[PDB]
Amino acid sequence: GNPLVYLDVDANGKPLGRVVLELKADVVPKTAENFRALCTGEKGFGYKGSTFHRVIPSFMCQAGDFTNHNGTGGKSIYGSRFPDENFTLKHVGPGVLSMANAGPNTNGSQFFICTIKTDWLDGQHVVFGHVIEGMDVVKKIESFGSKSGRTSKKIVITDCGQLS
Numbered sequence: 435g436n437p438l439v440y441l442d443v444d445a446n447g448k449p450l451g452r453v454v455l456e457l458k459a460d461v462v463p464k465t466a467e468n469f470r471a472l473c474t475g476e477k478g479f480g481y482k483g484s485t486f487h488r489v490i491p492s493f494m495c496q497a498g499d500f501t502n503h504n505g506t507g508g509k510s511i512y513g514s515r516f517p518d519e520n521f522t523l524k525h526v527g528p529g530v531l532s533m534a535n536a537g538p539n540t541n542g543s544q545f546f547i548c549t550i551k552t553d554w555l556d557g558q559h560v561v562f563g564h565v566i567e568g569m570d571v572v573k574k575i576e577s578f579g580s581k582s583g584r585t586s587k588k589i590v591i592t593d594c595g596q597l598s
């Protein structure tokens with residue numbers, strides 16, 4: 435079936451727990467495969483050690499810039515950027531897993547987990563998964579964000595990987 439991956443997340447060096455995500459390979463296989471491989475680190479790069487650099491309450495938690503750590507970088511397993519696969523899945527509510535971008539067809543590694551329905555992003559950002567467990571962990575991450583996105587503690591993916 436669709437892969438399951440995990441992120442273990444700290445806030446100023448204190449464990450928050452684990453987020454488990456289903457990647458919807460059956461709808462967006464390319465986009466799903468990118469995230470998977472970046473969780474495992476199997477290409478020699480990926481999410482381990484990187485941060486949630488932009489977190490806004492009642493919107494979303496953004497992470498995945500493992501090259502520059504500032505929200506400008508990241509790269510995919512296909513090269514630095516790749517196209518929008520499709521917009522079949524929608525931003526239907528909390529726990530949606532979606533690709534951050536800098537305009538049409540600029541997916542790299544940056545991603546976000548929604549904390550509400552973000553239906554205004556439908557057709558703008560490729561949804562490619564959903565939280566299976568750890569939505570309480572996402573709420574804790576959310577509690578360290580702000581209107582601007584600037585976080586109040588350093589939110590770190592200490593470890594990540596593939597479960598199935």
Ligand SMILES: Nc1ccc(CNC(=O)NCC(=O)N2CCC[C@@H]2c2ccccc2)cc1
Nearest residue numbers: 505506507534535536540541542543544546
């Ligand atoms: N490969 C790559 C991907 C993203 C960027 C930075 N762009 C960004 O952060 N854009 C905004 C974005 O994607 N999102 C996703 C949800 C939160 C935020 C956003 C979107 C719409 C309005 C306000 C913030 C640079 C390189």
